[PDB]
Amino acid sequence: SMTDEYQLFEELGKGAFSVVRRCMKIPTGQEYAAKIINTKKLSARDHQKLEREARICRLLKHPNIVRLHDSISEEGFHYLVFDLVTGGELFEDIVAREYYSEADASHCIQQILESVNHCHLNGIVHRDLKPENLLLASKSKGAAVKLADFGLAIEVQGDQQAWFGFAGTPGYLSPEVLRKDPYGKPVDMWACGVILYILLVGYPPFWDEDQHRLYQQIKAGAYDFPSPEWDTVTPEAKDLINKMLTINPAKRITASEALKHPWICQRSTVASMMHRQETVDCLKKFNARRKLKGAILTTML
Ligand SMILES: N#CCC1C=CC(=Nc2nc(Nc3cc(C4CC4)[nH]n3)c3ccccc3n2)C=C1
Ligand SMILES: [Cl-]
């Protein structure tokens, strides 16, 4: 069925137990990305996580989410056939731009928030919002940002919270997760705050090479807007970051709310248009740091 319906070509990239190869639908020649999961040695419990991801991805159909077209089961191998995206990471793209302002960062965050809101409307919490999962659909200057990798996503029932587990990437983890408290949709809005922060200045709000002091920072909500770099950032941008980086997740801004924040919905009159070279230079260093993997910026095993 799989080799009758698709033809696998080169490897695009990988995961901690999955390869992604470009593929073409037979006989139409249409391209997709196939995520290939070797299932021969998987536990039932691990296969159930694959079942969850396939199920969640089949539900989600949105301009800013990489669409799953097909979930094929064969003997020892499962295939998740996704839309192909050729623009790479949003964050790598930003560093190659000649001109980058708050209005650009707003444009990005707006798309990210539309995808998060669609997830949340459909009872899905992503739990690992991070630059790695934010890909441009194509290399076009106009390309949509698309949300990827639902390998850690959970299905919530309405606005009921639960102890879904300690899962995610340290630098982007929310206080309630770290606290071993019940959680839900708000954890994705904390993660967006962190991403927005890094989108404006190019370094993370919570940073310490000692994982323990990293978590104490997060739980205390101890981030600031230091000079000179934040001095040129609009009050409205900081206000949004503040509303997302609220320790009490009940009082944290929702995705829908964040889409009506003036910095987002009134971008053209509220977001600063000044080039932020120093951000592009910092993002360069940030991205380079991320490439090295290790403790803070890498999804927890
Ligand atoms: N899911 C998941 C994780 C994942 C793993 C590898 C990955 N790399 C990657 N992915 C892609 N493209 C891609 C990935 C997907 C689908 C989101 C898995 N659709 N398109 C390309 C395309 C061209 C050059 C290089 C590429 N690299 C992107 C995402
Ligand atoms: Cl479809």
Numbering used by the authors: -1 to 0, 11 to 309
The authors write:
Calcium/Calmodulin (Ca2+/CaM)-dependent serine/threonine kinases (CaMKs) constitute a family of 81 proteins in the human proteome that play a central role in cellular signaling by transmitting Ca2+ signals. Kinases in this protein family are activated through binding of Ca2+/CaM to regulatory regions that either flank the catalytic domain or are located in regulatory molecules. CaMKII proteins form large oligomeric structures. The N-terminal kinase domain is tethered via an autoinhibitory helix and a calmodulin binding site to a C-terminal oligomerization domain that organizes the enzyme into ring-shaped oligomers.
To address this, we determined the structures of all human CaMKII isozymes in their autoinhibited state. Importantly, whereas the crystallized constructs of the α and β isozymes contained the catalytic domain and the inhibitory region but only a part of the Ca2+/CaM binding motif, the constructs of both CaMKIIγ and CaMKIIδ additionally contained the entire regulatory region as well as a part of the unstructured linker to the association domain. However, the autoinhibitory helices in all isozymes were structured only up to residue 302. Different crystal forms were observed, containing one (CaMKIIγ), two (CaMKIIα and CaMKIIδ), or four molecules (CaMKIIβ) in the asymmetric unit. Similar to the C. elegans orthologue, the substrate binding site is blocked by the regulatory domain in all human CaMKIIs. The sequence flanking T307 represents a site that is incompatible with CaMKII consensus substrate requirements, raising the question as to how this regulatory phosphorylation site would be recognized as a kinase substrate. In the CaMKIIδ structure, T307 was bound to the substrate binding site and oriented in an identical fashion to that observed for T287 in the transphosphorylating complex. The T307-containing region adopts an unusual turn conformation not previously seen in kinase substrate complexes. This unusual binding mode was stabilized by hydrophobic interactions of the conserved residues I304 and L305 that bound inside a deep cavity formed by residues located in the P1 loop and in helix αG.
